[model samples]
Target: EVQTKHFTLKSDVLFNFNKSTLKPEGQQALDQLYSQLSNLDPKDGSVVVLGFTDRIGSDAYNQGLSEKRAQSVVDYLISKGIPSDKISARGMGESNPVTGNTCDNVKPRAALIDCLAPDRRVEIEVKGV
Candidate 1:
């Protein structure tokens, strides 16, 4: 029977504040994912990389940033030996926030940002034979 799995990594693990560039911590997360990739059947399995952001920016900006972040994960996986064509990446942007869009966007924003960390996360899902 085919099995599906979901993996999640928080934002700070992958990017430096407000940036989509990959960092060592993010690379480490990907390394862990790579370790598990051995169980996937190269011919029948597929993976999806998704990116999300806290509600701190214009929706358009956040959306694009999310897409870029998602793409970065896909790029790293490709560098680690997974075929690029076997996976897909997408940025959900600032939608469906796990943190509940209740934090103020200004005034004590720094504190709010910290409190909103959980919303800034990436998710990976795999379905395989």
Candidate 2:
């Protein structure tokens, strides 16, 4: 039987007030995740990276940003020695909202940002060894 585990990788550290560049904290987190993944047996496991974003921006921009965010995580993992062949990266963009579309009603940028932070995240799913 094949087993699966899902892990969430946060992007608050990578993303700034409105940026996609990974910060030191984000790099550290990625390093730790790479370390954990390095211990896994390749024959029995694979990693899937998923990216998301809030609805504050235009659909095209949000989509692109989400994809970039996900790719950044994948790149970081690769930098830590994880083979690109064993990892898959995807961007779901703003299609899924963890906290609902509160941005529609939230007027202030700060308020909207807060509501959207949860959506701006990356998730990793490990499956099938």
Clashes of each: 0, 3
Candidate 1 ranges with C-alpha deviation above 4 Å: 58-63, 101-107
lDDT of 1 by residue, 48-104 (tens): 899988777522243378888889989898898888788899988777888675665
TM-score of each: 0.84, 0.80
Candidate 2 per-residue lDDT over residues 17-70, each given as its tens digit:
445677789888877666566655677668888987666542224336777777
- Our model 2 lands, by Cα RMSD against the true structure, at 2.9
Candidate 2 versus the native: TM-score?
Answer: 0.80
Worst 10 residues of 1 by lDDT: 54-63
Q: Which pairs of residues collide in candidate 2?
A: 43-129, 44-129, 45-129
Task: Give the candidate number with the greatest TM-score.
Answer: 1
lDDT of each: 0.79, 0.71
